[PDB]
Structure prediction request, 666 residues.
Amino acid sequence: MKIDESLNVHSSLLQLIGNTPLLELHKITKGLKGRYFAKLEAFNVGHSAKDRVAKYIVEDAERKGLLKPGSTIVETSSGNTGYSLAMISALRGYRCIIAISDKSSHDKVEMLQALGAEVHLCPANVAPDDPRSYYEVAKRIHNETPNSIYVNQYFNPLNPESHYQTGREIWEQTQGEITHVVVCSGTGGTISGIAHYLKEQNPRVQVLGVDAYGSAIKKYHETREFDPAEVYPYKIEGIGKNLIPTATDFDVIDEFIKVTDKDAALMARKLARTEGLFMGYTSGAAIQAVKQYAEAGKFDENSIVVVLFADHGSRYMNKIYSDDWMKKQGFID
Amino acid sequence: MKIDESLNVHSSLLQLIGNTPLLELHKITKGLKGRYFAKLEAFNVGHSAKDRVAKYIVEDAERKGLLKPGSTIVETSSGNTGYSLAMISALRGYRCIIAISDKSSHDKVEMLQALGAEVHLCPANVAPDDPRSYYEVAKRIHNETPNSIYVNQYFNPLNPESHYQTGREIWEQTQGEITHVVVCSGTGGTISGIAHYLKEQNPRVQVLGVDAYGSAIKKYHETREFDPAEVYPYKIEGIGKNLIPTATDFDVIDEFIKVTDKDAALMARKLARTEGLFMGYTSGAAIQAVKQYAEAGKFDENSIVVVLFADHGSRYMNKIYSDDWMKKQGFID
Prediction:
C-alpha cells in the first residue's frame, strides 16, 4: 500500500499544515457590500496559523543541521507559536522550552505541558527589556542551553516568509479576484507574508490590519515612531504589541484599525452563535474590524474580502467563552 | 468568482465534515507488527466524528420537511453530538436543546452554550429510565416542544448509516489493504457503519471494538444478555454504555476489549508527547486497545491496522490533561 495526498493519506503530521479552507460567509456579514470569505487557519493540525511558522522555521533549522533528536527549541510565545513548536518538538524528539506571560490563561500553559514542553511563566506587565519578561527569559535560556535554537518570531524574517504560502492559497482560492484582505497583526508575519504574495500578483489589493487598544502598531504604521503613550495592558492575546517587531512589514500594509477588547469578545461570541464558527479572540477582532472597515466605506458591491481567522475558540474557554470572565471585564451584564 | 472544492473553497460549513486525514503512525506503535494508521476525525469542523452523525440526521430531517428556521433540535448527549448539533443549529437558525449528564466536565457545557444551545444538566448516576436521566429529560422536552425533533442517537438507525461513508474513506485511503480496524464503541454508530462498508468489500477485515470497565457492551456482544453486574460508573466519556443501543450492530463486530480509565488516560498523554497528536480520552483508549490487541497476537507483519481517533484533546483540559485531576483519580502520583 502507498500514501496518496488527494486520498488525504499522510506519512507525517507536518503535511497536515497549510492548504486550509476558504469559507464564504453569509450571515455574520449580512448587509455588507460585496462577498466575504474566511480563511480558516484553525484547520491546521495545531489549530492555528502558527503551525506554518513553526514548520517553516523548524524545517529550515533541520536543513541547516541545527536540530537533531535531543536538541532544544526555545521560544517566547503567548500560546499558539509555543503550541505548534511543542507539537513538532514532541514528534521530532526535541526538547521544547517556552517562555509565556501570565496574560495568557492557564489553559494554554497546560496544553503546552501536555505536549511535553517546559514552560516558564513570566509577569506580563513588565517592559520588553526587563530581564523578567518572556522575551528576555527565553533569550537567557537559549544562551544557557547548548544545542538550542531561539525561534524569536517577533524578529525572525522566516516568520513572514512562511506566510507567503498563505497568500498564495488566498490568491488561488479567490481565483485572483480578491480585493481586500483583513488580518490581525501580532508579530505581523501573517499579514506581511500574505501581503507580499498578493501585492506581487496585484498591487491594487488592499491589505488591512487590525490592532488592539494598548498597542504601538497602528501609530507606528502611520508615524514610524514608537509612542509609549500608545502602549498599555489589554486583554486580547495575539494582536498588537508593546514593541515594534521587524517581522511586520509596514510598507505593504495599506491601513490599520483598532478594535476594543470588548467588541472583539462580543463579536467572537456572535460569530459562534450566527455562523456556528467557534473561533478565537482575534477572529472576533478580525470580524469586528471588517464591520468597522465596512462602515468607513472600504468595500463595495464588487469587493472580494478575505478575513483571516487565526485560531480556534476552544483555547478561550476561560476568557471570552466564560460568562464569568466576560462579566468581570464588564463586557456583559 | 466561483467555488472550487479542490482549491478547498466552500460555500457551507457543512462541507467541512468528512474526508478526514489518515495518518501513518511510527512512534506510538513502535515495535508492533504491521503498519498502523490513525483516522483523524478531529479534523471535522466540529472536532469530532459526531459531525457526520449531526449532518446526516439534520439533512435527513430537512429533506423530510421537519426542520425550518425556528424549529427545535433536541438531543441527549455527553458532549460531542450535542456540540455538532448546536454548531449546525447555530448556522441554520434552529433552537438546540441538549440534555447532558454531570459526568461531563463543565468545559463541554460552556462550549454548547457558546454555540447558543440550551443545556439541561442531569445527574449521571441514575438508571436510564429514571425520569431525571439525560435520556428521559430530552424525551420530555421533545414531547413538550412543538416543531421539534429528537435525534436519539443511541436508537437512531441514521447514526450508523452516517458512518458508512467513514468506512468508504478508510477503504479507499488504505487502497483496499486494511486488515483490522480498531474503534471505540459508544452508541456503536461509528464502528457499525465502518464495519458495514468494510465487510461488504472484504469480509475478512477484522472489526475490533473497545469498551470501558463499567459498561455492558462487551458482555452483551459475547452473550447477547444485558448484565447489570457489568454496569457501574466510570470516567471515560463517549465509550461504553449503561444500556444496549440499537445503533450498535453486534453481528458485524468481531471482538470487543476493555481498557481501564487509567490506561486510556495515560495513553492519551503518551500519544500527545510521542506523536504530537493532541487527542481525546477515547483516542487514548483506542491506542491502548491496539497495544492490548497486539499483545494478544491479533496483528502480524502483513497487518494494515486503522485506529479511529474520535475527537480532540482540547475538550479534556479539566480531565486527562489536568495533572490535578489525574492525581485525584490516582492515575499519576
Q: What stands out?
A: The first strand of chain A starts at residue 9 and ends at 10.
